[PDB]
Design a protein around this ligand. Structure first.
Ligand SMILES: CC(C)(C)c1cc(N)c(C(N)=O)s1
Length: 209
């Protein structure tokens, strides 16, 4: 059962602006997605202080970067709080409507795309380098779900049947044909050290075979 939804016009217009605008500093996408995972891990860590049983789906709090050249995919995994079905379908999109309006107004007044995080809509920077994004997520209170969009105005949500996650969020970036530089170990290491050196969770960069 695959459900198809339309993006809000403002979010769709944001994704077009990200996809079409000429902007060479594309490497900031990794800073934003890693920043998103750190916040998800903060939320499960805070909630587990007043409730130790929330960590029954996994005690470890970490971020893993997994490149795959055969699939041409870069996967950012965290064991954060995850997102529910309502988070994917409309909760997180409606929050982003106000940040998108402010982000677009800032752009015409002299800002650039690298400040996208300051408006809380950093996730969409993934489309700087990916033609399709797959998000697999498992919240403690909901089932495992797969979100997917190739932009163009729509996204899909379905119950995930793959490997069970326990808890967290898996962002799979199906990279563009000319963005495979972000599969290189030495390139990922440089971006992590430059933009995310003080993240308070262990970041493991996986090596390919
Ligand atoms: C599309 C989906 C549900 C993956 C997200 C939208 C927003 N705005 C996210 C965020 N981290 O802000 S995640």
């Amino acid at each position: 059962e695959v459900e198809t939804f339309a993006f809000q016009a403002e979010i769709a217009q944001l994704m077009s602006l990200i996809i079409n605008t000429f902007y060479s500093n594309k490497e900031i996408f990794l800073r934003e997605l890693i920043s998103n995972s750190s916040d998800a891990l903060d939320k499960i860590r805070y909630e587990s202080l007043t409730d130790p049983s929330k960590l029954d789906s996994g005690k470890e709090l970490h971020i893993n970067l997994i490149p795959n050249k055969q699939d041409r995919t870069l996967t950012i995994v965290d064991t954060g709080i995850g997102m529910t079905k309502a988070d994917l379908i409309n909760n997180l999109g409606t929050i982003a409507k106000s940040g998108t309006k402010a982000f677009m107004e800032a752009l015409q007044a002299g800002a650039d795309i690298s400040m996208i995080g300051q408006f809380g809509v950093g996730f969409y920077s993934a489309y700087l380098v990916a033609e399709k994004v797959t998000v697999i997520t498992k919240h403690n209170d909901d089932e495992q779900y797969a979100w997917e969009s190739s932009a163009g105005g729509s996204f899909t949500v379905r119950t995930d049947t793959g490997e069970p996650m326990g808890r967290g969020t898996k962002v799979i970036l199906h990279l563009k044909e000319d963005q495979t530089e972000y599969l290189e170990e030495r390139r990922i290491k440089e971006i992590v050290k430059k933009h995310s050196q003080f993240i308070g969770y262990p970041i493991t960069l996986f090596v390919e075979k």
